Description:
- Chains A, B: Belongs to the rotavirus VP6 family.
- Chain A has helices at residues 2-17, 28-41, 75-99, 114-117, 134-143, 302-305, 342-352, 367-372, 376-392, and strands at residues 45-47, 58-60, 152-153, 158-168, 177-185, 187-194, 205-227, 236-239, 246-249, 251-253, 257-265, 268-274, 278-295, 317-331.
- By secondary structure, chain A is an alpha+beta fold.
- Chain D has 5 helices and no strands.
- In chain D, helix 2 packs across helix 4 (75-83).
- Chain D is elongated.
- Chains in contact: A-B, A-C, A-D, B-C, B-E, C-E, D-E.
- Chain A binds chain D through residues 38, 42, 62-70, 76, 80-81, and chain D through 10-13, 30-36, 39, 85, 87-89.
Amino acid sequence: MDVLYSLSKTLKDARDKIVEGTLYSNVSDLIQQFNQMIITMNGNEFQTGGIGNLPIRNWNFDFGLLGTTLLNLDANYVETARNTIDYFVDFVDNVCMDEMVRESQRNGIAPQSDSLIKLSGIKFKRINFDNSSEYIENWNLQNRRQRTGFTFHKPNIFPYSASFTLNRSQPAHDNLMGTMWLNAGSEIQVAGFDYSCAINAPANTQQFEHIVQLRRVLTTATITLLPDAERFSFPRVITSADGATTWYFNPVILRPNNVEIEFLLNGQIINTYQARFGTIIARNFDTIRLSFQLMRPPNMTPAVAALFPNAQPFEHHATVGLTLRIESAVCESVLADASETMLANVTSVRQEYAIPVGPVFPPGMNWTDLITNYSPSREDNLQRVFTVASIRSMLVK
Amino acid sequence: MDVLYSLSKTLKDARDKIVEGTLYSNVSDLIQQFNQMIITMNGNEFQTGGIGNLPIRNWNFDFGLLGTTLLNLDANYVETARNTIDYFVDFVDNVCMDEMVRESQRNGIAPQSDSLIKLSGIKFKRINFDNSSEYIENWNLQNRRQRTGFTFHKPNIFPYSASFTLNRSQPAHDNLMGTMWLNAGSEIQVAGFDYSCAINAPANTQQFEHIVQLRRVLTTATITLLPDAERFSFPRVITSADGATTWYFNPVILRPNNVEIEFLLNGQIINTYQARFGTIIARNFDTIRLSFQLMRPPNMTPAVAALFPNAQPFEHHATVGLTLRIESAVCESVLADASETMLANVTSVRQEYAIPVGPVFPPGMNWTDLITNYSPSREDNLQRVFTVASIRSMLVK
Amino acid sequence: MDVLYSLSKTLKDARDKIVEGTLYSNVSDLIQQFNQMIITMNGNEFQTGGIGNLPIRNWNFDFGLLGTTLLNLDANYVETARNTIDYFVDFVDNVCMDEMVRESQRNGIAPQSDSLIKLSGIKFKRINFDNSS
Amino acid sequence: IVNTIIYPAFGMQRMHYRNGDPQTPFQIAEQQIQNFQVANWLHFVNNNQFRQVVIDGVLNQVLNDNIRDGHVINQLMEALMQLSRQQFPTMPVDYKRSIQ
Amino acid sequence: IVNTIIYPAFGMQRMHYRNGDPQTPFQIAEQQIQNFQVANWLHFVNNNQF
Lengths: 397, 397, 133, 100, 50
């Protein structure tokens, strides 16, 4: 595997530092590494493809090396080189793709393809070099059984979930109390509604709570917390819990009272914030708990008083809400986020080549399904597959 | 300080470029640098920790050099090396953390910890090397007193502020005129409302204005400006200015008329945009001024006419708004943003080790409090502390 | 054009790897590249600006190469270097900006400015390197 | 030639060369040489097969030879040009000096 | 010099220095042993040119 990596940084730092003109002594250390490769390869035969709509191209090796003389590089030098690179590029592409589709229940963390299995061989190890690409960096640290870690802007930790829970309801759905929410990606919006505006509630206050359990712990999270859930601040006609009818939601928004956000880890409160809106830090957590209340306004101008009668019909529905967004965080497990193209690369290669659904990943590499049942096997396969996608993107975008 | 930096890039470019296989020649230049270190260290003695819940740890040095002999690298070579690296890693971590907690008013710029103060010593300067890490890059340029600069995605320049200003009000709060807004992070949403729909206003137009003063100048900002403030487009029950009662806001939205955004610098208009929605560039500014109007529709279909009577009660409240988001920008001062983990790292280390509140930073490294009173001392300490966090993240995430 | 690129990575990897205290050998491969430049340059003169409010400044080259005082650099070494870098920085800035304003319908994919058109010249190609950006 | 020359003074295969009995050791060297000049010599030399095909002045099969060679000569000029860039490292000094 | 004068009475012998032709022998002694005074000589001499 690590082998693979090199192959690229070799080519990149190659197709990059080898241009008409440059001074040799800038590539002396490089040139070498290169040749070393050709050698180890020559005399070997490979085969990629064979699955779904993926072509089966065959490869052989037999190449001359590179001069060492010349203060500076002459155009001619390049072209005779570029010609050799292009065969390796078109190669690796086919190598990546071939190992980027196969999945294995058992060792979904080990090499699969006939192409790569052959690389992990010892006789090829003589090629390793410069492992600084964030992903491989973490691939190693893990293989040695140590503490990994990645970086994500707007991580994708919440499987899509959009629903409600009626804590008080009746057939007519004319005096409901409960919560509705949308958990998706790195964001949570939750609203608590009480059609009665806590008219008969103790202390004229209705308590609400929303708990979200992450499938993986997030550390060093920078989070935006704002009052109100705009998504649930407008009139809606919603299906009843049993799907038999539809109810009407006509919200009027009040400030959430006694807001308390807790970021817990294994049941323990790691961070807690009381009514603090804006930017907050949650340093290590696997669960978020948002508690907030609707407090009936003790003093009301006529216009307000008119919205909240002592008796039904309740036509304006008191609603309080919160919005929480994880801007950035670190996770010990790979995840999709709003900036990295890994998930999209893997999903795209599989779609383009009509790769059949396998035993590990959900159909279409569906993110929600994947993160909902993020088993160890799916994670090991995802990491292998994400690391390969990152190796590929160093050369082919 | 710069010293510190090296220590890492040394290890990274180490735990990275040193592996079972590769040619000596690719690290020759490196190996050296490394050894050079061991030497300078050996003999010296250190001490980290001692504050709050932070453990106290002593470290000594007495290590062998590196075989500058071999051609290629054999597994055995690595393991005997990795064993030495791991002591430095576990070291630096403790070094960073120890200096990432102490603050200081007088000289909040220079080193604090017994650990680092000793490093700035001259006899260690024999270790600096490869300062391409964006942060250190700027740390230097600032010492030489020159033009710095960082890059940010959704920067965090606006302290949280959510409020309103009633320009026309009365006890019943049945015919108000004013603005309400939310400034937070990199976003501003502001709405201007006139319960009377400018019925008695000159030219049937009510003017609105929202001014936001940045605590630091932003340059090269890419900004999204859109009409409407969704956050203030729904029914609300709000507390009165004096907290004695609650008023009702029942908005109906009209397009903002004569929109003009000005990005000013020291009172001077640097950029001005008239009714231009979408992506706009603000190249250098310390203030944003949004001016917009509500113009009573001169022609109204019956349904519209019905919302705006000639006499009270005014039941539908005409509202116009704007939304402005700073996607990216450059600032000469460090700031929190939506992608970097610096603030979260510093805040997290302090929280984990129960570090007591100090004389410089607000309790909990609260961002809003920090940016609201972003004194020179807080900025110098923040930069020192952010630069250390970035040095640490090269090895420990 | 590619030429241009180098000029920078040269300076960056320079204003970065060249500091009070690093062992010479960590820049041996670098130092070289650098000098190579100075040479190719010295002698030729340039014109930047000459449009809108953009100032027309004239740049000329007359520099001595770089020493090699052994075993980690002494402060003095740096300062005599930084002084030379700063003239190139303030230069490139003016070079970039001058070619960052001109547009052309026909061939608006090639160099426009008198400054850059001169760089695409062959006698300069001798600089290009580390194209990883 | 191959061993006590080119390969090492040229720095390429410092693995000097191991031949048992393939099909034209002089040749194969080609497929793996990174310097065109050097590379043309190889194919031309391993060819120039004495273009064994002629029927002149009425039945005189006299295995002929390249106009090229003939007096196009260049072959020579190219044999030289390729030589003109074989001047470099590997072993003791009195070596390259003497050889080149 | 390297093998009979500096290593051999500077407790740096160990390996009476083995060299087998081409590359540069002063040079390599530079990046090997530590000592400043000794160390400056090396760079100044080695990379000294016209």
